[PDB]
Design a protein around this nucleic acid. Structure first.
Lengths: 193, 121, 85, 60
RNA sequence: GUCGGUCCUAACCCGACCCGUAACUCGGCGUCGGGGAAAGGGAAACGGGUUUAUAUUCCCGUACCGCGGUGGUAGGUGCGGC
RNA sequence: GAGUACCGUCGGUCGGAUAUCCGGCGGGAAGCUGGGAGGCAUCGGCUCCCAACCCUAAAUACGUCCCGAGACCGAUAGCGAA
RNA sequence: GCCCCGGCGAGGCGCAGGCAGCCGUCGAACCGGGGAUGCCCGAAUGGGACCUCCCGCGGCUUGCCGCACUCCCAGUCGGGAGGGGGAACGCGGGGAAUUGAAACAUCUUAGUACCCGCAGGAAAAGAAAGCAAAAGCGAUGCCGUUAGUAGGGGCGACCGAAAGCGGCACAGGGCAAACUGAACCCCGGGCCGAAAGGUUCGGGGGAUGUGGUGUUGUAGGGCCCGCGGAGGAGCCCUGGGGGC
């Protein structure tokens, strides 16, 4: 037990005791910096499913991002009318992934593993990101996360191998409809997404 | 001050609870940890639940009061996890503990239960 | 620097010879990276003399050059003969 | 000079010989501006051998 | 050692943090730290002679600054003038 | 294995057409007597499968390099440079 | 240009045909292998640059070590990581116009040139909430065909797949949870051992769960029951032979 009850509390927070908790917590988070390290996860069931243990080498980092889409900058030279838009654009990455990348900038000796949603507002979204030190012996002594010390896993979040990146790349659909997403997007000339 | 706390137990009760836990550890049976405690309560083997107030996030232990109130098992609060764990016989701290098979604490648990009821009402 | 590496070369020119005769001076070519004090030591050891003054200039070939004046107890001509000239 | 000979010697004799050859090299470079054009090459490489061998000895 | 740099700040600039940006070798407020004038501010040398070619830089003669010392006095415990 | 499957709407993209994939906004589940797919939506039948966590060699692409070759050029040619 | 081990076996001192001279038979030059020394700038890193040069602080005995920024484990000491470079190939984002349509605006050029970021000797993908149709297949990836087809489109100019069939090559494993409950991991020092490995002391973590079990579909696993008790496939080199 103790895990399904947390899952229940968070499956709809407006209905549980979590809404007002989150109101207060945000009152205090809005003053914090954009990337902040913490002691313990807020959604422990979800963390421990995504891969998180209470050993040395795991780090939890909250990130704040702004909501909505993009506003393109204006164009200097002449354009055709199908190419003048500035406002109603949206990004092709998700805010989850953008947050992961900001954290990866701030902690350079580390590597990202996964992330989970932890709050909303009218202007901001909040994600908690998990990270792992690949040069710790406690971490090189565990076969579940000893792959991460390899020579092809640095830049993971940047090339797109985290779950958010796979989602945004299209690697959750397998048959009809996903003819253009394997083995990659460049392989098909960006013609998927 | 958190919101899973429904009432204010004083020094009296908190200290008696720590000593009851230490005595029940050294004589009877003690289930340590939120998950052990939760399962004990779900199966009915729990005769008293000690909960900590020094906890964050509250989502760890915020399910226990509204469950023990149903199963009709008494529960008290205490203000620190390090002390509770030291009592239970750990170097790490505990957020929740369950007393099963009391030995030499029976009357302590009697009084704790009565005062907890008087306080809740 | 260290003694015995400072001094590269002694000079033999008409100006240097004039100074040897008149002023009791020696004229050396030295490693750029040495200072007046290191030059002083170097001369003292490599020749067992007491020195009075050192003056330096970097040339238009990339060479540091030292005019060295000894105390009137000693004599330049002596060491100039001890060397070749 | 031959490493066989140099290896029969002590660290202080080696230091002394290095100083001596340094001085002889200076005075030869001096008189050069004013026969046997190889004195300089040979002395340089002598000092080189001496330094290498002293470093070996100290590393043992 | 004494000429000038080297020191001080000016208009101005950079770095780190911070906020933004899909991102940056891009953009920027504030805090902190640092740079920025061989005609601004600013310890101290003048005459004669010497060389094919340097000299307030070398030689003679007469001097001055800054650090550290040795030895004596002023003073600590002294006066003159409405 | 939940702000997930799914539903509407906006922008982009695709051969993807009332039937591609990505993202923003507003709503939002069941959870083993369970759940998904079967080219408009829905009802029934049948067939196939169990998402929202992770690792993984071989067959492949390249040639700032090497070996080795040539119905290639032969000093205004051949690489810009014998 | 200095040293050592080997090969070759008499001359040698770069392109580069000179004067004068030295090295070598105690085995050179040359070739293969391994070591030493290695100025300043530069990621450039103790702090600064109108000139690849300057200015310093601690601690030990002129000589030396240490001291950037952002981070992890610790914590009054220490131990570690990143940063820059690299033809073409690679993953992820941002994104034009000339031109064509005999003008042009949707389309085309084109997810192109170019820009930003991240990796390697290969990268990326990869073990069905799939394909299909009265029959059946069985992870990914590459070639040849399917095919200028289905299908998109001022239905104009034009754009444009897949499944399957034939072959190359082949390989499958682990978590979360349920049930147990410290039975567990790491650092440093000491004793066995040739080593792979095993045993004690002091610290760091871990009850907000370390270790064990467990992993899937006309279901699988756990708890309960009975019966049975082939994890024995792999690690090392004091050894003895072989091939390259």
């Amino acid at each position: 037990g103790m895990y399904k009850y947390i899952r229940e509390a968070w499956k709809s927070p407006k209905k549980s005791y979590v809404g007002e908790l989150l109101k207060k917590r945000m009152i205090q988070w809005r003053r914090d910096p954009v990337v902040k390290r913490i002691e313990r996860p807020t959604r422990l069931d979800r963390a421990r499913s995504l891969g998180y243990q209470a050993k040395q080498g795991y780090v939890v980092v909250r990130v704040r991002v702004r909501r909505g889409g993009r506003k393109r900058p204006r164009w200097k030279g002449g354009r055709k009318p199908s190419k003048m838009g500035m406002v109603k654009y949206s990004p092709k990455k998700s805010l989850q992934w953008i947050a992961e990348e900001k954290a990866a900038r701030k902690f350079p000796n580390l590597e990202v593993l996964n992330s989970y949603w932890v709050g909303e507002d009218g202007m901001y979204k909040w994600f908690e990101v998990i990270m792992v030190d690949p040069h710790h012996p406690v971490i090189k002594s565990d076969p579940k996360i000893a792959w991460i010390a390899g020579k092809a896993h640095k830049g993971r979040v940047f090339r797109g191998l985290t779950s958010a990146g796979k989602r945004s790349r299209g690697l959750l659909n397998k048959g009809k409809g996903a003819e253009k997403v394997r083995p990659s997007i460049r392989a098909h000339q960006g013609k998927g997404k | 001050k958190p919101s899973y706390v429904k009432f204010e137990v004083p020094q009296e009760l908190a200290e008696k609870a720590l000593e009851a836990v230490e005595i029940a550890r050294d004589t009877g049976r003690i289930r340590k940890g939120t998950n052990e405690t939760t399962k004990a309560v779900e199966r009915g083997q729990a005769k008293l639940v000690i909960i900590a107030e020094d906890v964050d996030p509250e989502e760890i232990v915020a399910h226990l009061p509204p469950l023990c109130e149903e199963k009709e098992i008494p529960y008290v609060y205490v203000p620190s996890k390090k002390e509770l764990g030291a009592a239970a016989g750990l170097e790490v701290p505990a957020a929740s503990v369950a007393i099963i098979e009391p030995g030499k604490a029976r009357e302590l648990v009697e009084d704790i239960a009565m005062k907890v009821k008087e306080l809740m009402k | 620097m260290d003694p015995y590496k400072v001094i590269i070369r002694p000079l033999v020119t008409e100006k240097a010879v004039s100074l040897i005769e008149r002023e009791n001076k020696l004229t050396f070519i030295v490693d750029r990276r040495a200072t007046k004090q290191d030059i002083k030591r170097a001369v003292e050891e490599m020749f067992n003399v007491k020195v009075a003054k050192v003056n330096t200039l970097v040339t238009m070939k990339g060479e540091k050059k030292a005019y060295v004046k000894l105390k009137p107890e000693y004599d330049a001509s002596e060491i100039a003969a001890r060397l070749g000239l | 000079m031959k490493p066989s000979e140099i290896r029969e010697m002590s660290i202080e004799e080696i230091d002394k010989k290095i100083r001596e050859l340094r001085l002889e090299l200076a005075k030869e470079r001096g008189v050069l501006t004013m026969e046997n054009p190889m004195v300089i090459r040979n002395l340089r490489r002598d000092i080189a051998r001496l330094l290498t061998i002293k470093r070996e000895k100290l590393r043992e």
